[PDB]
């Protein structure tokens, strides 16, 4: 979507973007599996299991 | 570009004739300053050509 | 049509001259017809017609019968615009003093009679009478009396005795006064009677008298008999939306004056008592004074609104309004603004301008160019054609833009580079594209900053935007020769990334033909970019007579530096691309390029560097993640260790082994010395982090950590932000400065906790507010600088003085701060400088000391150069090109006409926004003492006895590379002229700022703890006991001995009693006063002092400015002087220096002078041009004073011209003024 | 705000100082297309004529 | 797209007289009173003047000679 500048962190400490990106990548990776099991219509077992 | 009631008009009428040449006049703000100073007990004037 | 502006007193008849009528009824537009009323404040008959070429009655409408006063209304049908020129007057009934000539600090009417102000103010309020022209009676000519005093006084002398009360009295006193006879009497009172008290006001009263006569205007005019009114167009009553009318406060005040004058006349003819009429007279005076200047008597408020109405004088002065927001700065047509962005593809000379913006801007060009090419019938049709956005008009716009430079401006304009001319590049959208290389000069970011565009009109303004303001013409700043165009963040990072090498890159150590093959290796994906590969490269180097000779050979390099070599120009060698290529390296490479190949090559080199940088810095990955920050695994320990190091100090203070302010430092020192541990833990682990096997042998090299390359390249990340990034971030202190004994112990990666963030919040707030509220400070400083500078321009070819300031390197304490070569480069010699052997010539009398002579003098041991300066230059109302120097966007001599004053003021004002044991010799040489008295003692070694003592080092060259000061009673181990080893301790003893600073340095303010100076040589002596303070006598040697002084005993001394001490000696400690530095030393000593001090505050942080600029300010500070004798002559230095020297060329005796020291704000006060003074200074005062004197301004300068709207006498305007002024007055 | 897939990396200086480089996909899905509502009214009022 | 006038200044190096002279010449070509002395490669009068300066075939002195000639030219048409 967007391409920022890496040089924009190490001056103004502002490290919140760094970790917001990692946590958001993980939070979207979980949704990847949720959407896969929704599209593959596997069953209601794997849904709860995950 | 600011003052000179004649300057704006002359420059505009020249810009369309392909002639880029200004005819500077007298900034109207300065004539107004002359009024505001001369309306006081101060007499301001101009001399030779 | 004019070349002189004069200001004189307004006479009660010269007022009736302008006035086209007498406003009688205090009325306006009627109420129901909205038409002007007869003899009102808007009367068409008095002032002018309502409509254009139309009468108020409506009988004459045609433009035919113009000059005629229709007997119906008396309104001459003419241009309605004349209602702006139409003055008027009011026949005031009782005389009324002009407030300006009574309230200004040098109260004009006050010292016009030597009458104290508190007396005239009592006379005006009708609270006391005053005698006038007694002749021969019991009373004087000027004497006050009360009710009971005037009661039985007329009986004593009915005739020959007159005594009035109020404004009539003041006026008639000014009428019968002789400004001639009294003057002849005040001449002797200044002649015989000594005692400055007898000369305080007299020396300024004689001047007011003689000038009051020389001008011509009479003293009776100090009282306004007729009050002139302002044209109704300068105080409109115009209607508005909804029907409400919008008027000016000038109206309300005028209406008041008219009402009260009418009421007074009605009483005077109605036979009223005195208690009523004397109240009416005072109300009239109140209204008139509040009309001229509201805020000096009682601040008469307005009507329904509580806010005080604005008076006449208030419409002139102040940063707001006229003279400051009108005549110096106005809004302009043919302009715009927008949010600016990137634009790398653009060249260093072009900028992206949004299409629609260009359309709206060049509308007047578009219309004409369309009607010319047979595409639009007439101008109106072209308007509709562009209003419809027809396809053809886009190509027409592209034809009009073609080579038509535009101007871009960044909101705060510190230096001249704030406005730069670029070549338009039509672009889609609404954002303004800006070239990254110029972002430094503009000092702008892409976080939402906006810039303004300006379109030139005249062919001149289009040429000046190409040969003066164009981007590619401004490369090296005028403040300092360093280029203002240096690669920023991404560029330097890409280059540094290429110019790197690890050890084991894919295919390293091999050989290739050259750059072509190296790039064939990189792009293919077969070779790396950081390989240590050595290849062949042809490095051109024009040699031996100026003939280019390409010497090809092989060198050790990397695959990356060899590729970057394809951008490098011809003349430059390969040694410039053999390093890590940091920001501080790319910059100097570009600088050598500039002063080797010229302007034209340097430009294209910079553009190429930018493109290549951005590309490579992009494709290198070059990112940052959470794992990049390497928290030293030793952190935990390093923390807890120093965390327990205080547990002993705590008991040390709990028992009584150390007091509070004693164990405080015990915590502070262990914490400061422990922070280096945690800071260096990640540092030495991050400067050699990456570990790889060279061909199969484990080894560590310069780390490749993403965060670290950004530091070693200088791209963005500095060093401190790294210690904050991975380790804990230091200790903060409360606003008190009490550093807390509770440092931060957690880093930024782990995350701060609630408690720790509070102290960070205070630190943040202090930084934020201290930087935000500082804007106005730096702005104010540079503003006063430009106001002291402007008129100073480069006119004269050569002055003709050998004087020259004495340039010597700063060498101080340990090592040099700035070599002699810098403070002498590009300047001019004053006297022939020779080799270390006398009777030689290394350089002739005066010659441009460009790089060549710099190297030549650097070869020899000559560390002392005599360079001419602006502080000393024989020139009237200007400067000579030689004395200034050369520094500019070029290495050539300063041109004849550039206004060096403004550029210097900016050169100091822009860097303003950045500011807030024994001795151990290092180098080997010989001890060379300077100005020291010594004596042998028990130990046999030497000891200093003079407080001042310099410790130079005469090496095998004969120069000085060491300079240390040693206090009284020191331990010496060599002596003067003695050999030393590699760092021998020859000294030992028992030791027992910012922008507000430079402000004081310029203002010549007197120090808090001054230090007395000597006025002559000879043994000093004491004197009378302690009475109030103390005494001190001066004992000269041969000449007269009348000098002495009183120095308080509560202030310790330093000078030796029975010892010779030359003039200008340290009679005490403490700071020094520049005024006292001019008298006892001279004109060069004081400038050498101010420059050396002001340069230190800037030298602290990363600021560099050639001494030349500061010299110009110093020269402007001593433009005044005081005369010692009278001589054959009948103040300004230049004027008297020419006027008395022309008669001194004649056998007649000259008159001696003494330079005075005026601060930048006190020197900007006195100026030949009164208009330029009243522009920024206290207008109300300046005009009053320059009005009683009948002063006459011929403008001769910059600000005055921009006021009257004329070509400034500088640069392009200086050539026009040259051709005009030549035949002018000749 | 909105969820944007960010990636810290330079791109031909298109972001150079603090400028932001956005994909075309974003401006296509109308995920930042903010709606505005201006209010411009006309006023017929009695005049001198 | 005239970017740098370095060589143009070299002929008259004053940096201001350049502008005055080039403006006189640019007028001559724009406000119709003369013809170009260099092949006009779509270049504006502003740039063509600087190019004439560069070639060394136009300056203050040369134009002062030409105008002085036309001074007598205007008097040789009145008998
Ligand atoms: Mg910003
Ligand atoms: Zn009439
Ligand atoms: Zn000089």
Coordinates of N, CA, C and O in Angstrom, one line a residue, chain C residues 321-458:
Chain C
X321 N 0.1 48.0 10.0 CA -0.3 49.2 9.4 C 0.6 49.8 8.3 O 1.2 49.0 7.5
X322 N 0.7 51.1 8.3 CA 1.6 51.7 7.3 C 3.0 51.6 7.6 O 3.4 51.2 8.7
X323 N 3.9 51.8 6.6 CA 5.3 51.9 6.7 C 6.1 50.6 7.0 O 7.3 50.5 6.7
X324 N 5.3 49.6 7.4 CA 5.9 48.3 7.8 C 5.1 47.2 7.2 O 5.7 46.2 6.8
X325 N 3.8 47.3 7.2 CA 2.9 46.3 6.5 C 2.3 46.8 5.3 O 1.5 46.2 4.6
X326 N 2.7 48.1 4.9 CA 2.2 48.6 3.6 C 3.3 49.0 2.6 O 3.2 48.6 1.5
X327 N 4.3 49.8 3.0 CA 5.3 50.3 2.1 C 6.5 49.4 1.9 O 7.1 49.4 0.8
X328 N 6.9 48.7 2.9 CA 8.0 47.7 2.8 C 7.5 46.4 2.4 O 8.2 45.7 1.5
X329 N 6.4 45.9 2.9 CA 5.9 44.6 2.5 C 4.4 44.8 2.1 O 3.6 45.1 2.9
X330 N 4.1 44.4 0.8 CA 2.7 44.4 0.3 C 2.4 43.1 -0.4 O 3.4 42.4 -0.7
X331 N 1.2 42.8 -0.5 CA 0.8 41.7 -1.3 C 0.9 42.0 -2.8 O 1.0 43.2 -3.1
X332 N 1.0 41.0 -3.6 CA 1.4 41.1 -5.0 C 0.5 40.2 -5.9 O 0.2 39.1 -5.5
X333 N 0.2 40.7 -7.0 CA -0.5 39.9 -8.1 C 0.5 38.9 -8.7 O 1.7 38.9 -8.3
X334 N 0.0 38.1 -9.6 CA 0.8 37.1 -10.3 C 1.6 36.3 -9.4 O 2.9 36.3 -9.4
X335 N 0.9 35.6 -8.5 CA 1.6 34.8 -7.5 C 0.7 33.7 -7.0 O -0.5 33.6 -7.5
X336 N 1.2 32.9 -6.1 CA 0.4 31.8 -5.6 C 1.1 31.0 -4.5 O 2.2 31.5 -4.1
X337 N 0.6 29.9 -4.1 CA 1.2 29.1 -3.1 C 0.6 27.7 -3.2 O -0.5 27.5 -3.7
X338 N 1.4 26.7 -2.6 CA 0.9 25.3 -2.6 C 1.8 24.5 -1.7 O 2.9 24.8 -1.3
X339 N 1.2 23.3 -1.4 CA 2.0 22.3 -0.6 C 3.1 21.7 -1.6 O 2.7 21.3 -2.7
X340 N 4.3 21.7 -1.1 CA 5.4 21.2 -2.0 C 5.7 19.8 -1.7 O 5.5 19.2 -0.6
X341 N 6.3 19.1 -2.7 CA 6.7 17.7 -2.6 C 8.0 17.5 -3.3 O 8.7 18.4 -3.7
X342 N 8.4 16.2 -3.4 CA 9.6 15.7 -4.1 C 9.4 15.9 -5.6 O 8.6 16.7 -6.0
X343 N 10.3 15.3 -6.4 CA 10.7 15.8 -7.7 C 12.1 15.5 -8.1 O 12.8 16.3 -8.7
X344 N 12.6 14.3 -7.7 CA 14.0 13.9 -8.1 C 14.3 14.0 -9.6 O 15.4 14.6 -9.9
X345 N 13.4 13.5 -10.4 CA 13.6 13.6 -11.9 C 14.0 15.0 -12.4 O 14.6 15.1 -13.4
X346 N 13.5 16.0 -11.7 CA 13.8 17.4 -12.0 C 15.3 17.6 -11.9 O 16.1 17.0 -11.1
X347 N 15.8 18.5 -12.8 CA 17.2 19.0 -12.7 C 17.3 20.1 -11.7 O 16.4 20.7 -11.2
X348 N 18.6 20.3 -11.3 CA 18.9 21.3 -10.3 C 18.5 22.7 -10.6 O 18.5 23.6 -9.8
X349 N 18.0 23.0 -11.9 CA 17.6 24.3 -12.3 C 16.1 24.4 -12.5 O 15.6 25.5 -12.6
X350 N 15.3 23.3 -12.6 CA 13.9 23.3 -12.9 C 13.1 22.8 -11.7 O 13.6 22.1 -10.8
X351 N 11.8 23.2 -11.7 CA 10.9 22.8 -10.7 C 9.5 22.5 -11.3 O 9.1 23.1 -12.3
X352 N 8.8 21.5 -10.7 CA 7.5 21.2 -11.2 C 6.4 22.1 -10.7 O 6.2 22.2 -9.5
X353 N 5.7 22.7 -11.6 CA 4.7 23.7 -11.3 C 3.3 23.1 -11.8 O 3.2 22.7 -12.9
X354 N 2.3 23.1 -10.9 CA 1.0 22.5 -11.3 C 0.4 23.3 -12.4 O 0.4 24.5 -12.5
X355 N -0.3 22.5 -13.3 CA -0.8 23.0 -14.6 C -1.8 24.2 -14.3 O -1.6 25.3 -14.8
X356 N -2.9 23.9 -13.6 CA -3.9 24.9 -13.3 C -3.4 26.1 -12.7 O -3.8 27.2 -13.1
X357 N -2.4 26.0 -11.8 CA -1.7 27.1 -11.3 C -1.1 28.0 -12.4 O -1.2 29.2 -12.4
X358 N -0.4 27.3 -13.3 CA 0.2 28.1 -14.4 C -0.8 28.8 -15.3 O -0.6 29.9 -15.7
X359 N -1.9 28.1 -15.6 CA -3.0 28.7 -16.3 C -3.5 30.0 -15.7 O -3.4 31.1 -16.3
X360 N -3.9 29.9 -14.4 CA -4.4 31.1 -13.7 C -3.3 32.2 -13.6 O -3.6 33.4 -13.8
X361 N -2.0 31.8 -13.4 CA -1.0 32.7 -13.2 C -0.7 33.5 -14.5 O -0.8 34.7 -14.6
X362 N -0.4 32.8 -15.6 CA -0.1 33.4 -16.9 C -1.3 33.8 -17.8 O -1.1 34.0 -19.0
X363 N -2.5 33.8 -17.2 CA -3.7 34.3 -17.9 C -3.4 35.5 -18.7 O -3.8 35.5 -19.9
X364 N -2.7 36.6 -18.3 CA -2.5 37.8 -19.2 C -1.6 37.5 -20.3 O -1.8 38.0 -21.4
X365 N -0.6 36.6 -20.2 CA 0.2 36.2 -21.3 C -0.6 35.3 -22.2 O -0.5 35.5 -23.5
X366 N -1.3 34.4 -21.7 CA -2.1 33.4 -22.5 C -3.1 34.2 -23.4 O -3.2 33.9 -24.6
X367 N -3.8 35.1 -22.9 CA -4.8 35.9 -23.7 C -4.2 36.5 -24.9 O -4.6 36.4 -26.0
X368 N -3.1 37.3 -24.7 CA -2.4 38.0 -25.8 C -1.8 37.0 -26.8 O -2.0 37.2 -28.0
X369 N -1.1 36.0 -26.3 CA -0.5 35.1 -27.2 C -1.5 34.3 -28.0 O -1.2 33.9 -29.1
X370 N -2.7 34.2 -27.5 CA -3.8 33.5 -28.2 C -4.3 34.5 -29.3 O -4.5 34.1 -30.4
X371 N -4.7 35.7 -28.9 CA -5.2 36.6 -29.9 C -4.2 37.0 -31.0 O -4.6 37.4 -32.0
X372 N -2.9 36.7 -30.7 CA -1.9 37.0 -31.7 C -1.8 35.9 -32.8 O -1.7 36.2 -34.0
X373 N -1.9 34.7 -32.4 CA -1.7 33.5 -33.3 C -3.0 33.2 -34.1 O -3.1 32.2 -34.7
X374 N -3.9 34.2 -34.2 CA -5.1 34.0 -34.9 C -6.1 33.0 -34.4 O -6.9 32.4 -35.1
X375 N -6.0 32.7 -33.1 CA -6.9 31.7 -32.5 C -8.0 32.3 -31.7 O -9.0 31.6 -31.4
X376 N -7.9 33.6 -31.3 CA -8.9 34.3 -30.6 C -9.2 35.6 -31.3 O -8.2 36.4 -31.6
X377 N -10.4 35.9 -31.6 CA -10.8 37.2 -32.3 C -10.3 38.4 -31.5 O -9.5 39.2 -32.0
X378 N -10.8 38.5 -30.2 CA -10.3 39.6 -29.3 C -10.1 39.0 -27.9 O -10.4 37.8 -27.7
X379 N -9.6 39.9 -27.0 CA -9.2 39.5 -25.7 C -10.3 38.7 -25.0 O -10.1 37.7 -24.3
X380 N -11.6 39.3 -25.1 CA -12.7 38.6 -24.5 C -12.9 37.2 -24.9 O -13.2 36.3 -24.1
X381 N -12.7 37.0 -26.2 CA -12.9 35.6 -26.8 C -11.8 34.7 -26.2 O -12.1 33.5 -25.9
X382 N -10.6 35.2 -26.1 CA -9.5 34.4 -25.5 C -9.8 34.0 -24.1 O -9.5 32.9 -23.6
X383 N -10.5 34.9 -23.3 CA -10.9 34.6 -22.0 C -11.8 33.4 -21.9 O -11.6 32.4 -21.2
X384 N -12.8 33.4 -22.8 CA -13.8 32.3 -22.8 C -13.0 31.0 -23.3 O -13.4 29.9 -22.8
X385 N -12.1 31.1 -24.2 CA -11.4 30.0 -24.7 C -10.6 29.3 -23.5 O -10.6 28.1 -23.4
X386 N -9.9 30.1 -22.7 CA -9.2 29.5 -21.6 C -10.2 29.1 -20.5 O -9.9 28.1 -19.7
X387 N -11.3 29.7 -20.4 CA -12.3 29.4 -19.3 C -13.0 28.1 -19.7 O -13.4 27.4 -18.7
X388 N -13.1 27.7 -20.9 CA -13.6 26.4 -21.4 C -12.6 25.3 -21.3 O -13.0 24.1 -21.5
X389 N -11.3 25.6 -21.1 CA -10.2 24.7 -21.1 C -10.1 23.9 -22.4 O -9.9 22.7 -22.4
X390 N -10.1 24.6 -23.5 CA -10.0 24.0 -24.8 C -8.6 23.5 -25.0 O -7.6 24.0 -24.4
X391 N -8.5 22.4 -25.8 CA -7.2 21.7 -25.9 C -6.0 22.6 -26.3 O -4.9 22.4 -25.8
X392 N -6.3 23.5 -27.3 CA -5.2 24.3 -27.9 C -4.5 25.2 -26.8 O -3.3 25.5 -26.9
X393 N -5.2 25.5 -25.8 CA -4.7 26.5 -24.8 C -3.6 25.8 -24.0 O -2.7 26.5 -23.5
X394 N -3.6 24.5 -23.8 CA -2.6 23.8 -23.1 C -1.2 23.9 -23.8 O -0.2 24.3 -23.2
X395 N -1.2 23.7 -25.1 CA 0.0 23.9 -25.9 C 0.4 25.4 -25.9 O 1.6 25.7 -25.9
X396 N -0.6 26.3 -25.9 CA -0.3 27.7 -25.9 C 0.5 28.0 -24.5 O 1.5 28.8 -24.5
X397 N 0.0 27.5 -23.4 CA 0.6 27.6 -22.1 C 2.0 27.1 -22.2 O 3.0 27.7 -21.6
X398 N 2.2 25.9 -22.8 CA 3.5 25.3 -22.9 C 4.4 26.2 -23.8 O 5.7 26.3 -23.5
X399 N 3.9 27.0 -24.7 CA 4.7 27.9 -25.5 C 5.0 29.2 -24.7 O 6.1 29.7 -24.9
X400 N 4.2 29.6 -23.8 CA 4.5 30.8 -23.0 C 5.4 30.5 -21.8 O 6.2 31.4 -21.5
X401 N 5.4 29.3 -21.2 CA 6.2 29.0 -20.1 C 7.7 28.8 -20.5 O 8.6 29.1 -19.7
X402 N 8.0 28.6 -21.8 CA 9.1 27.9 -22.3 C 10.4 28.2 -21.6 O 10.9 27.4 -20.8
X403 N 11.0 29.4 -21.8 CA 12.1 29.8 -20.9 C 11.7 31.0 -20.1 O 12.3 32.1 -20.2
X404 N 10.7 30.9 -19.2 CA 10.2 32.0 -18.4 C 10.3 31.7 -17.0 O 9.4 31.1 -16.3
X405 N 11.5 32.1 -16.4 CA 11.7 31.7 -15.0 C 10.6 32.2 -14.0 O 10.0 33.2 -14.2
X406 N 10.5 31.4 -12.9 CA 9.6 31.7 -11.8 C 10.3 31.8 -10.5 O 11.5 31.3 -10.5
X407 N 9.7 32.3 -9.5 CA 10.4 32.4 -8.2 C 9.6 31.6 -7.1 O 8.4 31.7 -7.1
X408 N 10.4 30.8 -6.4 CA 9.8 30.0 -5.3 C 10.4 30.5 -3.9 O 11.6 30.8 -3.8
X409 N 9.5 30.6 -3.0 CA 9.8 31.2 -1.6 C 9.3 30.3 -0.5 O 8.2 29.8 -0.6
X410 N 10.2 30.0 0.5 CA 9.8 29.3 1.7 C 9.4 30.3 2.8 O 10.0 31.3 2.9
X411 N 8.4 29.9 3.6 CA 7.7 30.8 4.5 C 8.6 31.7 5.3 O 8.6 32.9 5.2
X412 N 9.5 31.1 6.2 CA 10.5 32.0 6.8 C 11.7 32.2 5.9 O 12.4 31.3 5.5
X413 N 12.0 33.5 5.6 CA 13.0 33.9 4.7 C 14.2 34.4 5.6 O 14.2 35.6 5.9
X414 N 15.1 33.5 5.9 CA 16.3 33.9 6.8 C 17.3 34.6 5.9 O 17.7 35.7 6.1
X415 N 17.9 33.8 5.0 CA 18.9 34.3 4.1 C 18.3 34.7 2.7 O 17.1 34.6 2.5
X416 N 19.2 35.0 1.8 CA 18.7 35.4 0.5 C 18.2 34.2 -0.3 O 17.3 34.3 -1.2
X417 N 18.8 33.0 -0.1 CA 18.4 31.8 -0.8 C 17.0 31.4 -0.5 O 16.4 30.5 -1.2
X418 N 16.3 32.1 0.5 CA 14.9 31.8 0.7 C 14.0 32.1 -0.5 O 12.9 31.5 -0.6
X419 N 14.5 32.9 -1.5 CA 13.8 33.1 -2.7 C 14.7 32.7 -3.9 O 15.8 33.3 -4.0
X420 N 14.3 31.7 -4.6 CA 15.2 31.2 -5.7 C 14.3 31.0 -7.0 O 13.2 30.6 -6.9
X421 N 15.0 31.3 -8.1 CA 14.3 31.2 -9.4 C 14.6 29.9 -10.1 O 15.7 29.4 -10.2
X422 N 13.5 29.2 -10.5 CA 13.5 28.0 -11.2 C 12.9 28.1 -12.6 O 12.2 29.1 -12.9
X423 N 13.0 27.1 -13.4 CA 12.4 27.0 -14.7 C 11.2 26.2 -14.7 O 11.3 25.0 -14.3
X424 N 10.0 26.7 -15.0 CA 8.8 26.0 -14.9 C 8.8 24.7 -15.6 O 9.3 24.5 -16.7
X425 N 8.2 23.6 -15.0 CA 8.0 22.3 -15.6 C 6.5 22.0 -15.3 O 6.1 21.6 -14.2
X426 N 5.7 22.1 -16.4 CA 4.2 21.8 -16.2 C 4.0 20.4 -15.8 O 4.7 19.5 -16.2
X427 N 3.1 20.2 -14.8 CA 2.9 18.9 -14.2 C 1.4 18.8 -13.8 O 0.7 19.8 -13.7
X428 N 0.9 17.6 -13.7 CA -0.5 17.3 -13.4 C -0.7 17.3 -11.9 O 0.3 17.0 -11.1
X429 N -1.9 17.5 -11.5 CA -2.2 17.5 -10.0 C -2.3 18.9 -9.4 O -2.7 19.8 -10.1
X430 N -2.0 19.0 -8.1 CA -2.0 20.2 -7.4 C -0.8 20.5 -6.6 O -0.7 21.6 -6.0
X431 N 0.1 19.5 -6.5 CA 1.3 19.7 -5.6 C 2.5 20.3 -6.4 O 2.6 20.1 -7.6
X432 N 3.3 21.1 -5.7 CA 4.5 21.7 -6.3 C 5.7 20.8 -6.1 O 6.0 20.4 -5.0
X433 N 6.3 20.5 -7.2 CA 7.5 19.7 -7.2 C 8.8 20.5 -6.9 O 8.9 21.6 -7.5
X434 N 9.6 20.1 -6.0 CA 10.8 20.8 -5.6 C 12.0 19.9 -5.7 O 11.9 18.7 -5.5
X435 N 13.1 20.5 -6.1 CA 14.4 19.7 -6.3 C 15.0 19.4 -4.9 O 15.2 20.3 -4.1
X436 N 15.3 18.1 -4.6 CA 15.8 17.8 -3.3 C 17.1 18.5 -2.9 O 17.3 18.8 -1.7
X437 N 18.0 18.7 -3.9 CA 19.3 19.3 -3.6 C 19.1 20.7 -3.0 O 20.0 21.2 -2.2
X438 N 18.0 21.4 -3.3 CA 17.8 22.7 -2.8 C 17.1 22.8 -1.5 O 17.0 23.9 -0.9
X439 N 16.5 21.7 -1.0 CA 15.8 21.6 0.2 C 16.7 22.1 1.4 O 16.2 22.6 2.4
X440 N 18.0 21.8 1.3 CA 18.9 22.3 2.3 C 18.9 23.8 2.4 O 18.7 24.4 3.4
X441 N 19.2 24.5 1.2 CA 19.2 25.9 1.2 C 17.9 26.5 1.6 O 17.8 27.4 2.5
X442 N 16.7 26.0 1.1 CA 15.4 26.5 1.5 C 15.2 26.2 2.9 O 14.4 26.9 3.6
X443 N 15.8 25.2 3.5 CA 15.5 24.7 4.8 C 14.0 24.3 5.0 O 13.3 24.8 5.8
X444 N 13.6 23.4 4.1 CA 12.2 22.9 4.1 C 12.2 21.4 4.0 O 13.1 20.8 3.5
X445 N 11.1 20.9 4.5 CA 10.8 19.5 4.5 C 9.5 19.2 3.7 O 8.9 20.1 3.1
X446 N 9.2 17.9 3.5 CA 8.0 17.5 2.8 C 6.9 16.9 3.8 O 6.3 16.0 3.5
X447 N 6.8 17.6 5.0 CA 5.9 17.2 6.0 C 4.6 18.1 5.9 O 3.9 18.1 6.9
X448 N 4.4 18.7 4.8 CA 3.2 19.7 4.7 C 3.6 21.1 4.5 O 2.7 21.9 4.4
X449 N 4.9 21.4 4.5 CA 5.3 22.8 4.3 C 4.8 23.3 2.9 O 4.7 22.6 2.0
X450 N 4.5 24.6 2.9 CA 4.0 25.3 1.7 C 5.0 26.3 1.2 O 5.7 26.9 2.0
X451 N 5.0 26.5 -0.1 CA 5.8 27.5 -0.7 C 5.0 28.4 -1.7 O 4.0 27.9 -2.2
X452 N 5.5 29.6 -1.9 CA 4.9 30.6 -2.7 C 5.6 30.8 -4.0 O 6.8 30.7 -4.1
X453 N 4.8 31.0 -5.1 CA 5.4 31.2 -6.4 C 5.1 32.6 -6.9 O 4.1 33.2 -6.5
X454 N 6.0 33.2 -7.6 CA 6.0 34.6 -8.1 C 6.4 34.6 -9.6 O 7.5 34.0 -9.9
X455 N 5.6 35.2 -10.5 CA 5.9 35.3 -11.9 C 6.4 36.6 -12.3 O 5.7 37.6 -12.1
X456 N 7.6 36.7 -12.8 CA 8.2 38.0 -13.2 C 7.4 38.6 -14.4 O 6.8 37.8 -15.2
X457 N 7.5 39.9 -14.6 CA 6.7 40.5 -15.7 C 7.7 41.2 -16.7 O 7.6 40.8 -17.9
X458 N 8.5 42.1 -16.3 CA 9.4 42.8 -17.2 C 10.5 41.8 -17.8 O 10.8 40.8 -17.1

